[PDB]
C-alpha cells in the first residue's frame, strides 16, 4: 500500500549559536585543507615527468580513466592518500597507483591504473598493499577488474617489504587466478613496460590489449638479461607488441594508441555477458529534508564534546525517515531501519560508551538484519567500553563478545563510517578494519588508537611505579613531564586521519556532505554479489 | 561563404552532445533491473576533486579544444581557448522534435538539436550552425613467405622481371587446396629461389628483390 | 595385488671425496648453530623471570604444553625463531608465544600458549602475526584451538603496528568467531591476567577453564580504570575466578591450579565428539633405504654449486620408491608420485632454471594431482626463469603463468620445502608463501630474495647510467664499488634463513634429517580436512 | 551505455569480375536444383496415395502441421532428404516421417508426424534414425514432443536393421520414458492405425488424442492375431476410439475428426504451465549491412579455391559487427564475438589448414565462451591438419587434442555449419556430428570424407607397393589407372551433400541466404534449456 504517512528525524539547528559557528569554522577548515591536499596529489610526479610522459605520446592515467568509464558517470576513487608522508624523503603520490570503482559499458568495474609518472611506475610497499585491497574489494563484490598496466617492477632497497610474505607482490597473481576461477573477468591493457613482475599481470588475464610500439612484456628486460645472462637486446623487439601479437601469443587484441586501447576495452567489457540481478527490495529514492553543511555545524572538530548521531542519520537517509529499534533500552547505541537511494539499510550508530544493554541491543539487531538480508551501516563514534567494577561483575566482557561474534559472522554487506573517535575493543564491536567491512571511510575529524594517549601514559606510569616498587623510588614531576610529553605526542600523531589513510587502514577520508553520495555508490557496488545465509557461532548467554 | 562559429555556439554544441550521452544513459537505465541507483546520473562527481572533460569539436576546417568542468550543482564551466563560459541547460521535446535549452553566462537561448552520425545541427532564429565531431583513426582506417610445406605448382616470374602489387607470383598445392603466392611488394625479381616442382617450407623466402 | 617388484631411487655417495667431506662439515656447522640458538630460545625471558613466575605457583609454558599433550607424543612447534633480532634492543624469544600442533586426547590440536616470562606476556607485532598464522593453520586444516592465555594486552610503544589494520590484533577475535561458526572448537585456559584485549580471548571461546586465585579476566584493569574512570579496585575481586565462575558467568570450568586446568582441558577435548575420517588411500609405511646425514654430505652450503634433487627424494620417501612423470621432457623439473608414511604424495622438485617445457610439465602434473586428490610437496631450489630473447619469443611468460595459475587454483594440501635458493617469479611458480601452502619449512642453507644480489646492483647501476645519460657523466670505479658494497651486503643480510623466519615468512628452519618426520607430521595434520573439488581458471594456451 | 560507435566487417565485392559471375552461376545452379528436389519430396507418395488418403477423410501430414502450429509462424523442418536414393528401388520421401521445430500455443515444440502416404506409414531404418534424432533434439533442448501417429509398424525384410540394436526402434519408447521423467511433455494424436510397435507411442504419452472411427490402437492387429492366435476380429471394434476412450482407458481426449484433434492439441499445449526463461543477455536485433546472394558470389562451388570466412560472418551477424579475438596469431582460425538476433554468439571459423597456433587459439576461445555462457557457432571449411615433420616435432597432435577435448567437454549450445570441405581429424576439432552439436546444417557445395580421394588412392597404392615389396613387382600404369578410377569415383560419390543427408548425418542442406534465419531459429530453440557449468578434462600442456 505504502500510502500512509510517517514521521521523520532531525531538527533545524541554531544557526546563530556560538557552538554552531565555531563548529562550522573548524570543520570548514578541515575540509578546505583536505581539498587542497588532494589537489596537490592529483598532479602526480610533477610537471617534468608529465611532460616526459606526454612526449612519448601517452595519456596521463587520470585521462585514461576518464576515457575508459562511461561519459558523465561518477568515479569512486579509493585511497587517494596512500603513501602520504609515509616514506622519509620520497614522495609517492596516490600510492603510485589509482584504484577506483567506475562504470564501463554499463557494468560497475574495479579499475587499477599504474600511475607511471611517479618513480617510473615502481612498486613501493604501499602500492602492493593498495592494489591488494582493490583486488579483495573486487573479489568480495564480484566486480570485473581492469588493470591499466604501465609498471616499473618492484623497488630494490625496499625489496624485503615488497617480495616474500603472504600479502606481498605474489598475492596479486594469486588473486588473479582465483577471481578468474570464479568467473570474475580480468582485463589487462598494456600501455607501458612490464618488467618481470608486471609481466605476469597481462599473462594472467583472460583478455589483453597491448599498444603498438609502446607496450612491452618480458620476464627479463635488457639490463636484467645483461646482469643475469649477459646479453644485449633491444626492448621493442625483445618484447614489443608485434612479437606478442603475432608469434608468441601473449596478447589478444592489438591497439594503435591509447584511445584505441580504451575503445577496445569498452568493447571487451560489453562482450562479457553480464547482467546485474538484485535480490533486495527497491523503493523510489528520495532526498533528505535537511542540508549537509549542517553536518559541519553539528559535528565540529572537538572529540571531547559529544553530539547526537540522529542528526547525521537525518541528513544521509531517504526523506529523513528512520524506524528506530529499541529506542529506550541501551540508548548509547542507536539502531534502526532506513533507506539510502532506495536500498534498505540497517544503521548502528554510537552515542556514548558501550554498556552491557547496548551490546545486547546491537546483537539482537544484527541477527535481525542477517535474517532479513538487510545491509548494515556502522557509524563509529566510540570512546570506550565502560571500565568499572559493577560492570565486570555483570559480564560486560561477556556481552561485548556477543556483539563482536555477531558482527564477525554476519554475511550481509557491511559498511563502516568513522565519524568521531574509535578506541579499544569498542572498535571491534562496531566493525573495524579487521572484521571485513566492504568499505570503511572516515571523516577528517576522526581519531583511532588503542586508547587516547592520556590513558596510555597513565597506565604506563602506574605500571612502572608498581614494577619499580620491588625496590622503589620516585622521580615524580620528572617522570610525569617526561612521560606525558612523548606519549601524548605519539598518540596524537598516529591517531590522525592522514596517518591512518597514508597506510591502507581505510578506503578514504571523505567530506561530510559527499557522505550520502559515497554511501550510495558503495552500496550499489556491494549489491553485485548475492547475499548468502549467515551461520553464527555459539552465543555465550 | 561559411562563417566561423562563435565560442557560445561551440558551448551549445558541446552541451547538446553531453546531454545526448546522458539520454543514452537514461534509456539504458530504464531497461535495467538496478533502477534508481547512483552511477545513472551523469554528474561527473569525483571524490574530493572536480572532473574536467577535454573534447575537441571541428568548426569547418579548424579544431577547437573545449575543457568542460563538471560542477557540483549540475552546471558546466567550459573554457574555450582561454575564455570560460558558465553553461547550463537541458533537453525537452515538442512533438517529434528535440530542443536544447541553454543558458550561457546568463544569456538564455533555445535551438533545435539534431545529431546525425558526426554532425551536430543547431537550428535557431539567428541561423543554422553545423559543428562536426572528429572521427578517431581506429574507426576510419578500414618479401613473400611460403605458407605450408607443399609442392610448387607454377612459377610466374623470372630473374629480372618487374611486377605489380596483387599479382600472381607462385602457386603451390598443399594437401587439399590451392594457395597462390601473390606480391604485395614493389621492385624487380632478381631471384627465383625454388625451381618448379620443388617442396617449399613454411615461413620461407621464395622471391628476393634487391 | 601389490606384490610385484619395482625399482628405487638413490645411489650411495663417495664418503671419501673432498666435495662430500667439505659439504658435510659446512652443513654440520649450520645445524649445530641452529641447535644452540634454539636452545637459548628455549629458556624464555631469563632465569630471573622464570624464578618470579614459579614463585607465584605457575608452570612454565613448555611445562604446560608437556602436561597437556598425550604422553610421549611428538610436538610440532611452529616458528621458534619469530622475533629473532627483529626489534633493535629488545629480545623477544619465540615471539612471546608458543604455537604448535600436538595430540591431545587422541585429537590433533593447535596449541597457542602465551609465554608470560617475556615482557609479561605483552603482544609485540610479531606476536600478533605468529598467532594469526597459527589460527589460519587451524582453520585451513580444521584443528581445534587451545589457547593457554597468560597475556598482558597490547604493547603500546608500538601500538600502531599492533592495533588498527586488517591483520592486526582484532583479527584474532574474527578468527575465533568464524572457526566456531564452522564447528572448529575453541578452548581457552585462563592461567594469567587477561587485560582488555586478552579478555576477549576466553569470552569468545566455547568452553573456558579459569584457575582459582590466579586467572583474571577484565575489560579494564586497575590502572586502566584509574586512568579512564578514576577508580581503585583490587584485581582478584575485580576479575577473579570466583566472580566469573559464580556470578557473571564468563567461565565454565573452575580449576584449583594448573595441573587441574590441564586435566580438565583433556576432558573437554575428549567430549568434543570428533572422529577423524580419511579419504586418501593408505598403505603400510616403510622407512627409506638411505640415511639422512647423507643429505648433509649432498647438499652442503654452496648455492652456486648445483646438485640432484633425486638424492633428496631418495632419502625422504617410503622405501625410496618413486614413479617419475615425464622424466625426459623438461628435465629441470622432477615430478612424480611417492609415499610418505603411507600417504600418497605428488612431488615437484627443482633441478635447474625453469624453461618453458618444465613449466608445461608442471602444469600437467598439478592438474593430474588435483584430479586424483593427491597432496603436493614442492621442493624449491630456484635460481631463475630463463632470461633470454629466443625464450621470450616462444612465450616463457605465457608458460610460467600457467604454472602459477595451476598452483594457485589447486585445492589439495600443498607443502613447500625450500632446500636451496628461491628467487624471482620462480618462487611463485613453486608455491611460495603467497600461494597458501599449508606449511613452509626451510633448510639452514636457503636464500630468498627478489633475485640474487649481484643482479640487483647491476640492474640499478645500468639503469642509472641510462637515466643520467640525458646529460651523462660517469663515476666508474667509484659508482662500481659504492653500489657493489651496500647492495650485496643488504641482499645477503635479508636473504638469510634467520632473517626470514624472524618474521613469520615461514613455519620453521628445520634440520635436513628431521625433514622426513616433519613432513609426515604436517601431512597427517593436513588430512583432517576433506579435500574439495578444484576449479581452474582459464589456461592461456 | 552502449552508445559509442564501432566498426563493422565486410567489403562489397566486384560484381563484374569473372570470378564473381562464375561463382554466382554455379551456386545459383546448386540452389535451384536443391529447390526442385525438395519440391518433389513435398508431394510424398504420389497423387494416387494422396487421393486414397483424402478419400478416407484425413488431412495430408503437412496440412496437419500447418493447422497445428501458430498461424503465420515459421517451421524449421529437419532432414528433408532422409532416405533420398538410399534404398535400391524403393522411394522413401522425407524418410517417411516429418520432424520439425514449430511454435504451438506460444511454446516451441518438436513435431513428429508419420507421413502415411509413403508405404502406409511403414518404418524403414532411416525412419527410426530420423525419429530418434528428433527425440534427442527435444531432450537436449527441453522441447515438448507432439507425435502425430499414423503408423504402419516395422517393415519386414529390413527387420534386422529396424529391430534389436541399441539405436533401433525400441529406443523410441526409452526416450519417451526418460523425457517424461524430466518434465518434458509428450503428446500423441492418434490419427491412423498403430499396429503393435506404434501402439506403444500413445500408451507411453502423458496425454492422448484419438479420432472417432479413424484412429486404432492395438498390440496385435487382425492379421497378427490371425497368424499368432488364429482369430478373426474387426479392427474398429478391436481397437477403435470408443473402446479405448470408454472402457480400456488408453485415450484421454476424444476427437471428432482431424481438425478437432488439432484444436484439442493446442488446448493441451496451453495447459502445460510452461514459461520460457532466458539466462543470456539480449540486445535489440539488427539486420546486417550486406545482402545474402553475395554469398553465392563469394563461395561459389570450387573447393580447391579458398575464400575468406569474414565475408560470411559479415552477412549473417547483427549489423555486421564482430569483435575479433587474437586476430594475428594463428590466422587460419577466425574467432570472435558477434550477435545473431540479439543473442551473443562466439564464432569459430576455418580459413586454411590447422596449425598448432590455430588450435591453441581455439582452445583459449572455447574456454572463454564456456566461462561466460556464450553459445558457439562453428563454420567448417577444412582441408587438413598440417602434415609435415617439423610440425609433428612440435606437438601438432598434442595441440589438436586440446581443441578436441575442449569442444567435447563444452556445455554451452554448439551449432555447426559446414560451408565447405570437412576432412579428417580436423572435422573432430571443429565440432563434427560425433561431438553432439545441437544442430548441424550444410551448404550445397560441401564435401565430407576421411580425406580427399586422391590422397586415399595414393596412400593405398604406396602401401600396397610397400606391402608387395616383400617379393616385389610393379603394374605401374595399370595399377595407377585401375586404382585412380574406383577410388576417386567412390570418394566423390560418398562425399556429396545428398549422400550425407540421405542418412541422418546432418540436420539439413540449407540455402546460403536462409542461413541467417535458420541460425536464429535454432539458437532460440537451443535456449530453452538452462546452460550448465562446464568441467574440462586434463589439458595436456
Ligand atoms: C629486477 C626486479 O624484478 S626488481 C626491479 C625491476 N627490474 C628492473 O628492470 C629495474 C630497472 N628498472 C626498470 O624496470 C625499467 O628499466 C624502468 C621502468 C625503470 C624504465 O623506466 P624509464 O621510463 O626508463 O624511467 P627510468 O628508468 O629513468 O626510471 C625513473 C626512476 O625510477 C627509478 N626506478 C624505476 N624502476 C625501478 C625499479 N624497478 N626499482 C628501483 N627503482 C626504479 C629509477 O631509478 C629512476 O630513478 P629517479 O626517479 O631517481 O630518476
Ligand atoms: C595496553 C592495553 O591495551 S591493555 C594493558 C593495559 N594495562 C596493563 O596491562 C598494565 C598492567 N598489566 C600488566 O602488564 C601486568 O603487569 C600483568 C599482570 C599482566 C603482568 O604481570 P606483572 O607481574 O604485572 O608483570 P610486570 O608488570 O612486572 O611486567 C614487567 C614488564 O612488562 C611490561 N608490560 C606488561 N604489560 C604491558 C603492556 N600492555 N604494554 C607495555 N608493556 C607492558 C612492562 O613494560 C614491564 O617492563 P620491564 O621489563 O621494564 O619491567
Ligand atoms: C510385427 C511388427 O513389428 S509391425 C507389423 C505389423 N503387422 C501388420 O502387417 C499390420 C499391417 N496392416 C495394416 O495395419 C495396414 O497395412 C496399414 C494400416 C499399416 C496400412 O494402411 P492400408 O490403407 O491398409 O495400406 P496397406 O497396409 O493395405 O498397404 C500399404 C503398403 O504398406 C505395406 N506395409 C504396411 N505395413 C507393413 C509392415 N509392417 N511391413 C512391411 N510392409 C508393410 C503393405 O505391404 C503395402 O505395401 P505396398 O506398398 O506393396 O502396397
Ligand atoms: C579511550 O579510548 C579511552 C580508554 C579505552 C578503554 C579501554 S582500552 C581497553 C579496554 N577495552 C575497552 O573496550 N575499553 C577498555
Ligand atoms: C637470481 O634469482 C637470478 C636473477 C633473477 C631472474 C629474474 S628476476 C625477475 C624475472 N623473473 C624471473 O622468473 N626471472 C627474472
Ligand atoms: C583432405 O582432407 C586432405 C588430407 C587429410 C589430412 C590427413 S587425414 C588424417 C590426418 N589427420 C589430420 O587432421 N590430417 C591428416
mmCIF file of C-alpha atoms and ligand atoms in Angstrom, chain B residues 175-176, chain D residues 383-385 387 423-426 450-452 455, ligand 6:
data_model
loop_
_atom_site.group_PDB
_atom_site.id
_atom_site.type_symbol
_atom_site.label_atom_id
_atom_site.label_comp_id
_atom_site.label_asym_id
_atom_site.label_seq_id
_atom_site.Cartn_x
_atom_site.Cartn_y
_atom_site.Cartn_z
ATOM 1 C CA UNK B 175 47.283 -31.301 -49.204
ATOM 2 C CA UNK B 176 43.781 -30.439 -50.309
ATOM 3 C CA UNK D 383 41.205 -29.413 -45.720
ATOM 4 C CA UNK D 384 43.550 -30.829 -43.122
ATOM 5 C CA UNK D 385 45.741 -30.726 -40.073
ATOM 6 C CA UNK D 387 51.018 -32.931 -42.297
ATOM 7 C CA UNK D 423 38.094 -33.828 -43.828
ATOM 8 C CA UNK D 424 39.978 -35.903 -41.310
ATOM 9 C CA UNK D 425 40.526 -35.224 -37.649
ATOM 10 C CA UNK D 426 40.028 -31.560 -38.492
ATOM 11 C CA UNK D 450 38.065 -39.124 -44.269
ATOM 12 C CA UNK D 451 40.417 -37.334 -46.690
ATOM 13 C CA UNK D 452 40.093 -36.319 -50.343
ATOM 14 C CA UNK D 455 45.060 -38.915 -51.002
HETATM 15 C C1 LIG E 6 41.953 -33.968 -47.248
HETATM 16 O O1 LIG E 6 41.220 -33.844 -46.241
HETATM 17 C C2 LIG E 6 43.461 -33.883 -47.139
HETATM 18 C C3 LIG E 6 44.214 -34.980 -46.369
HETATM 19 C C4 LIG E 6 43.734 -35.279 -44.949
HETATM 20 C C5 LIG E 6 44.712 -34.963 -43.819
HETATM 21 C C6 LIG E 6 45.132 -36.215 -43.043
HETATM 22 S S1 LIG E 6 43.859 -37.294 -42.904
HETATM 23 C C7 LIG E 6 44.404 -37.903 -41.288
HETATM 24 C C8 LIG E 6 45.325 -36.902 -40.638
HETATM 25 N N1 LIG E 6 44.609 -36.138 -39.646
HETATM 26 C C9 LIG E 6 44.532 -34.862 -39.976
HETATM 27 O O2 LIG E 6 43.905 -33.878 -39.193
HETATM 28 N N2 LIG E 6 45.124 -34.645 -41.138
HETATM 29 C C10 LIG E 6 45.701 -35.859 -41.671
#
